[PDB]
Amino acid sequence: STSQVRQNYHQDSEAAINRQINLELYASYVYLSMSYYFDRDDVALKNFAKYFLHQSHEEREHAEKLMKLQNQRGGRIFLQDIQKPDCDDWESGLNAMECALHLEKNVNQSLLELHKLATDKNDPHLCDFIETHYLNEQVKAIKELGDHVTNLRKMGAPESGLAEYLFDKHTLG
Amino acid sequence: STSQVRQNYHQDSEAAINRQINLELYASYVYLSMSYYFDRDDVALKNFAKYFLHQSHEEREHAEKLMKLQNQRGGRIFLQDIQKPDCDDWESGLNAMECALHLEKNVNQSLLELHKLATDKNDPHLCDFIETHYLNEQVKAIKELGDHVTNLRKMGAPESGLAEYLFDKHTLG
Amino acid sequence: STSQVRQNYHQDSEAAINRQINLELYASYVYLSMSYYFDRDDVALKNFAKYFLHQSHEEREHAEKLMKLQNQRGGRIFLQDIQKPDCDDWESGLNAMECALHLEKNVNQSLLELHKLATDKNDPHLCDFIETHYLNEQVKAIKELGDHVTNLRKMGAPESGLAEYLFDKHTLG
Amino acid sequence: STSQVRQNYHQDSEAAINRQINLELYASYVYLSMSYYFDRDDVALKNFAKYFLHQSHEEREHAEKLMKLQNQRGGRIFLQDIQKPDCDDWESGLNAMECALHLEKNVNQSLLELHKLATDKNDPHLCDFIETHYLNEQVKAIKELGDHVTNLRKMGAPESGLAEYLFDKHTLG
Amino acid sequence: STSQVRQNYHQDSEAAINRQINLELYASYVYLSMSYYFDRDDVALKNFAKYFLHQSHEEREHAEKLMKLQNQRGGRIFLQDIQKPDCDDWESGLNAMECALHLEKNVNQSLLELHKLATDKNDPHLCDFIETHYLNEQVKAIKELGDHVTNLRKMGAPESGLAEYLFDKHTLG
Amino acid sequence: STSQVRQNYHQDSEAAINRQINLELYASYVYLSMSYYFDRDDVALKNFAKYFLHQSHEEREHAEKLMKLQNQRGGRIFLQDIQKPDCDDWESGLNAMECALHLEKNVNQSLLELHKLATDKNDPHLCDFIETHYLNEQVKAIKELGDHVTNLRKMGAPESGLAEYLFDKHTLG
Ligand SMILES: [Mg+2]
Ligand SMILES: [Mg+2]
Ligand SMILES: [Mg+2]
Ligand SMILES: [Mg+2]
Ligand SMILES: [Mg+2]
Ligand code: NA
Ligand code: NA
Ligand code: NA
Ligand code: NA
Ligand code: NA
Ligand code: NA
């Protein structure tokens, strides 16, 4: 039953990877929802829509890289339901950016816990995988989202629809 | 509350589109599972893996086009959980192809019912959307999968691991 | 008297096509009026002017394609007066966009009725002509105009002349 | 016995497709006859000959696309004898064009009946296949042939051998 | 109420320009009718059709340039109904050319009266606008149409359908 | 009644050419049937299908060259019904290749008889036409088909579906 390739790969690490795969797919689905919210005729912020669609695809890529990891190490992927996002209506560009920031920080926290587990199980390959492909990506994403939220707030979002319009044009466009 | 763009778009059609979006996302997730099954070290059919990964991405594209439709017509997207696939282990190239064929026929049946609803609601735009973007795509996908299943069976899959190996190389490669 | 090419083309369909030709020419004339309203020295929104002039030419193209249809089927074109637009003065970028949206929805309703007639007369060629060349075009135009109206309103049009200025620059330019 | 790919494809539709295949092959053979009539030394209208030969090959393509359809849907092709054309000697450029027009209208009528059957059997894929690939093609072919017949008649065919000569040169050449 | 740009622009000139705009749009519509007459399957003179369609578009360009003039001078455009053309059926290539010649001479007469008004109101800008953009254009158009009519008549139009055929090919093609 | 170009062209030769035209069209139709047999979802040998479709088109070309011959010599083409092929279902790649070989040998025998007739009628032009365009073509086709049949048999067709699969890939692909 044990994979011929498996070496120094703890069952707990395998399970945590499966959980991270689900979380990445969940994040992808959240971003998809946000994108198409901004595509609504009564919201109509095309560059917000594009920004979040790109993020959705990137999150899918992250999940697939974790699946590849799982198979490389000889673990077995076990997929779960991808839960629907918390909202259907994201209310504003600013609110969407804040929710994205919160999501990214949650994903980062899960990654940090994964790293802690890898460290505890003396799995340096897994640790460096997380470090190389995930942690800096998260730090960058969080910094970018924080920058966006800051600009929107200073511009006067969400009450200034002009604010969101011009942010859509000049930052996200 | 009614969208400014909405015209000749029945609530039942809107709901059916939301169901189709979920079904397309489900199909994408099924194909993702199959792809990474073939990426396992104890299965190791890279071109099967690639074939199903491509199909997964294509299904995601189909879902996104339906979401775009929904917003174009002034309906509102309501996302649901994406259920996990029926299997974790797809057993063989042939079995995966047969399950894919079954899935594609189920998706096609749902599309046909959607078309019937559009027709009943006298929604020619929706009918032609389905016709143009979905129905022929489905017919082609079903024919291709049937061709694959036929070849694998004639070659001697799934007992002939040589059969699947050579199919992976010569058809899917 | 009956055209040598005519086949499965009902008199009622022919008459409805003649009405649609007139409606398309009318829409082209409305858009022409709007364009040159924005060219006034006391309005001076060049990109609004360009947007509506492009729309005018596109509507002319639609009418000409219907005339070509009529001759292809062996019907006979009967032209009518092109009525002058409802306004000389369109008041604002937002008001013009709202009137354009209303016009586009009226044109769409007429197209839907034309499709219904074709269906009732079992004229699949005519149905698919309408579907292929007109219905999606209308859906897109309505969605775009709705997006424009939404943005202008959120920006603060028509009281914010800055709003219309910046929309002219960043969206229509 | 039922094809693994077959879905929503009525036996009556399958039979009608087989009949249409035969009709398209028949039309191809008629045009072949006309082409080589104009290649006779005592007729000697090379561009008529080329025009009808092109039409013959196009009709063959139409038949082959229907065969491909049949297999795509999981129906089974049953071929029949291709009947010889009604004439060996087509008498004149004008007479050939009139017979071609009559043939094209007969083919169109058969296509319309096929569409009606598809509609009655709620086969939207088949309907849109016919609509996309056949109906407009027929309308165009009929209009072109009607234009040709009109010009020949106005020029003075078939008594003015100069008429046919110059039509061969300037229209068909 | 007076435009900030208006200078040396008499109310009578403004009104005459509005009348000329309507006349140019009328001429465009007449030429459109003629074009699609020649597109009929029972007339079938493609190059006549093209010639008149080009003329239609050119006349629309003339109208739009007058509208631009009106706004440049600070007058206000007031559009009127575009009357339907005098005929639905233009009978022959020659008859259409003669009606076009008559139309062009009427347009020219109106332009000459406009010039006379400009001169009487000491509006040298308007005079030179008319001179530069319109008068020579009209002279050329009238000369060309007269040349066409002369050739058709000498060839034997409209009784020689060969005449019109060959004119369509060699002059208009 | 006798063609102005006819010289040294016996009535018996003319009749034999008409028979050969029909036989070539028959062969084309047989190959068409075989091609689309291999396009079936339950057969699914794309390169067999392509091979036989190419052969079908080549046979049509042969028939058309014979028609051109007939007119060049001043004979008159008389077309007959094209009989349907002997089978609807060709059973296997090997069986299809064997039937094709048999067909090609029958066509060759008919050509040899045609040559014998030409020789007996002292028609060296006809003899050399047959020699140049047909006889070597037939010899090559027969040799190729024999090679194919030999390979399939040695590989283990038709019981080894792997055999036909790999032949389709490596020889016909
Ligand atoms: Mg490190
Ligand atoms: Mg700005
Ligand atoms: Mg359709
Ligand atoms: Mg000449
Ligand atoms: Mg020799
Ligand atoms: Na991520
Ligand atoms: Na799909
Ligand atoms: Na339109
Ligand atoms: Na056809
Ligand atoms: Na003019
Ligand atoms: Na042959």
Coordinates of N, CA and C in Angstrom, one line a residue, chain C residues 92-148:
Chain C
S92 N -27.5 65.8 -21.4 CA -26.3 65.3 -20.7 C -25.9 64.0 -21.2
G93 N -24.6 63.7 -20.9 CA -24.1 62.4 -21.3 C -24.9 61.3 -20.7
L94 N -25.3 61.4 -19.4 CA -26.1 60.4 -18.8 C -27.5 60.2 -19.4
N95 N -28.1 61.4 -19.7 CA -29.4 61.3 -20.3 C -29.4 60.7 -21.7
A96 N -28.3 61.0 -22.4 CA -28.2 60.4 -23.7 C -28.0 58.9 -23.6
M97 N -27.2 58.5 -22.7 CA -26.9 57.1 -22.5 C -28.2 56.3 -22.1
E98 N -29.0 57.0 -21.2 CA -30.3 56.3 -20.8 C -31.2 56.3 -22.0
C99 N -31.3 57.3 -22.9 CA -32.2 57.2 -24.0 C -31.7 56.2 -25.0
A100 N -30.4 56.1 -25.2 CA -29.8 55.0 -26.0 C -30.2 53.7 -25.5
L101 N -30.1 53.5 -24.2 CA -30.5 52.2 -23.6 C -31.9 51.9 -23.9
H102 N -32.8 52.9 -23.7 CA -34.2 52.7 -24.0 C -34.4 52.3 -25.4
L103 N -33.8 53.0 -26.3 CA -33.9 52.8 -27.8 C -33.4 51.3 -28.1
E104 N -32.3 50.9 -27.5 CA -31.8 49.6 -27.8 C -32.7 48.5 -27.3
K105 N -33.3 48.8 -26.1 CA -34.3 47.8 -25.7 C -35.6 47.8 -26.5
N106 N -36.0 48.9 -27.1 CA -37.1 48.9 -28.0 C -36.8 48.1 -29.3
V107 N -35.6 48.3 -29.8 CA -35.1 47.6 -31.0 C -35.1 46.1 -30.7
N108 N -34.6 45.8 -29.5 CA -34.5 44.4 -29.2 C -35.9 43.8 -29.1
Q109 N -36.9 44.5 -28.5 CA -38.2 44.0 -28.4 C -38.8 43.7 -29.8
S110 N -38.6 44.7 -30.7 CA -39.0 44.4 -32.1 C -38.4 43.2 -32.7
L111 N -37.1 43.0 -32.5 CA -36.4 41.8 -33.0 C -37.0 40.6 -32.4
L112 N -37.3 40.5 -31.1 CA -37.9 39.4 -30.5 C -39.2 39.1 -31.1
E113 N -40.0 40.1 -31.4 CA -41.3 39.9 -32.0 C -41.1 39.3 -33.5
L114 N -40.1 39.9 -34.2 CA -39.8 39.3 -35.5 C -39.4 37.9 -35.4
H115 N -38.6 37.5 -34.4 CA -38.2 36.1 -34.2 C -39.5 35.3 -34.0
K116 N -40.4 35.7 -33.1 CA -41.6 35.0 -32.8 C -42.4 34.8 -34.1
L117 N -42.5 35.8 -34.9 CA -43.2 35.7 -36.2 C -42.6 34.6 -37.1
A118 N -41.2 34.7 -37.2 CA -40.5 33.7 -38.0 C -40.8 32.3 -37.5
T119 N -40.7 32.1 -36.2 CA -41.0 30.8 -35.6 C -42.4 30.4 -35.9
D120 N -43.4 31.3 -35.8 CA -44.8 30.9 -36.0 C -45.0 30.5 -37.5
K121 N -44.2 31.2 -38.4 CA -44.3 30.8 -39.8 C -43.4 29.7 -40.2
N122 N -42.7 29.1 -39.3 CA -41.8 28.0 -39.6 C -40.8 28.4 -40.6
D123 N -40.1 29.5 -40.3 CA -39.0 30.1 -41.2 C -37.7 30.0 -40.5
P124 N -37.1 28.8 -40.4 CA -35.9 28.6 -39.7 C -34.7 29.5 -40.2
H125 N -34.6 29.7 -41.5 CA -33.6 30.6 -42.0 C -33.7 32.0 -41.4
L126 N -34.9 32.6 -41.5 CA -35.1 33.9 -40.9 C -34.8 33.9 -39.4
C127 N -35.3 32.9 -38.6 CA -35.0 32.8 -37.2 C -33.5 32.8 -37.0
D128 N -32.7 32.0 -37.7 CA -31.3 31.9 -37.5 C -30.6 33.2 -37.9
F129 N -31.1 33.8 -39.0 CA -30.5 35.2 -39.4 C -30.6 36.1 -38.2
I130 N -31.8 36.3 -37.6 CA -32.1 37.2 -36.5 C -31.1 36.8 -35.3
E131 N -31.1 35.5 -35.0 CA -30.3 35.0 -33.9 C -28.8 35.3 -34.1
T132 N -28.3 35.0 -35.3 CA -26.9 35.2 -35.6 C -26.4 36.6 -35.6
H133 N -27.2 37.5 -36.3 CA -26.7 38.8 -36.6 C -27.2 39.9 -35.6
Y134 N -28.4 39.7 -35.0 CA -29.1 40.7 -34.3 C -29.2 40.5 -32.7
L135 N -29.7 39.3 -32.3 CA -30.1 39.2 -30.9 C -28.9 39.4 -29.9
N136 N -27.8 38.7 -30.2 CA -26.6 38.8 -29.3 C -26.1 40.2 -29.4
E137 N -26.0 40.8 -30.6 CA -25.6 42.2 -30.8 C -26.4 43.1 -29.8
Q138 N -27.7 42.9 -29.8 CA -28.6 43.7 -29.0 C -28.3 43.5 -27.5
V139 N -28.2 42.2 -27.1 CA -27.8 41.9 -25.7 C -26.6 42.6 -25.3
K140 N -25.5 42.5 -26.1 CA -24.3 43.2 -25.8 C -24.5 44.7 -25.7
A141 N -25.1 45.3 -26.7 CA -25.3 46.8 -26.7 C -26.1 47.2 -25.4
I142 N -27.1 46.5 -25.0 CA -27.9 46.8 -23.8 C -27.0 46.7 -22.6
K143 N -26.2 45.6 -22.5 CA -25.3 45.5 -21.3 C -24.3 46.6 -21.3
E144 N -23.7 47.0 -22.4 CA -22.7 48.0 -22.4 C -23.3 49.4 -22.0
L145 N -24.5 49.7 -22.6 CA -25.2 50.9 -22.2 C -25.6 50.9 -20.7
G146 N -26.1 49.8 -20.2 CA -26.3 49.7 -18.8 C -25.1 50.0 -17.9
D147 N -24.0 49.4 -18.3 CA -22.7 49.6 -17.7 C -22.4 51.1 -17.7
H148 N -22.5 51.7 -18.8 CA -22.2 53.2 -18.9 C -23.1 54.0 -18.0

